[PDB]
Chains A and B, each alone.
Chain A
Amino acid sequence: RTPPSLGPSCTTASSSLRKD
């Protein structure tokens, strides 16, 4: 069917990487 939603999950975070 067609779905509902509520208010604001998880926190979005950042990691690093290889400097290639």
Chain B
Amino acid sequence: SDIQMTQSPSSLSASVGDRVTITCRASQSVSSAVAWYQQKPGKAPKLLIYSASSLYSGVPSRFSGSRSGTDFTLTISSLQPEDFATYYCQQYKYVPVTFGQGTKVEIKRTVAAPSVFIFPPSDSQLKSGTASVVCLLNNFYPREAKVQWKVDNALQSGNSQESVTEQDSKDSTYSLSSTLTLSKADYEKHKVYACEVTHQGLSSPVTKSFNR
């Protein structure tokens, strides 16, 4: 069969100067042939540690990792601004080399609340036959943040997309664009469409609506 590599902190958030670690398990004895890679989206991957403990050249000494039988850990002592990305565990013992599903490190900040806007759909968009309306959560410290599209006290039926972006560099906060897309014929029959947010910073549900 093939070798499954699973990084147990699916997500994690932390602060500058921590000893944080990621763990990754293999389906069977990979015999300390494991690498670790970092990758900020768009840009290419870069290599950090090979064979689980040997640090690559040009790589900062604050990195290291550890093998405990099947379980492989990645250790970083006093992290810096450079060390903020998704992290990948590879095995290369058996020919079908595999990769973990991806441990993304967040940034811990004051739980800033998402300033939730809304937008009636464009006049030029309604001229095509379908309409889309963007709810724009903006600049929030809880990555975990949800959006409940509703139209006339009734929810969405899967007729809505979502698109989270990366955390900004110096602003350090998130942003979200959940887009409910329905036909023009279905947009003018229903009365009031509205976007309801359940982020962590704001306590009560925040709803905004429009009927033009």
Please report A residues at the B interface, Cβ cutoff 8 Å. 13-14, 16
Contacts and interface: CB of A to CB of B under 8 A. Distances in A.
B69 A16 contact: yes
- Closest 3 A/B residue pairs (Cβ): A14-B31, A16-B69, A13-B29
Contacts, number: 3
Interface of B: 29, 31, 69
A11 to B, nearest CB: 11
> Which label, helix, strand, loop or mixed, suits the secondary structure of the B interface?
loop
A16 B29 CA distance: 12
Nearest to A15: B69
A16 B69 CA distance: 8
Contacts of A14: 31
A13 B31 CA distance: 9
B176 to A, nearest CB: 45
Contacts of B69: 16
A16 B31 CA distance: 10
A15 to B, nearest CB: 10
3 contacts: A13-B29, A14-B31, A16-B69
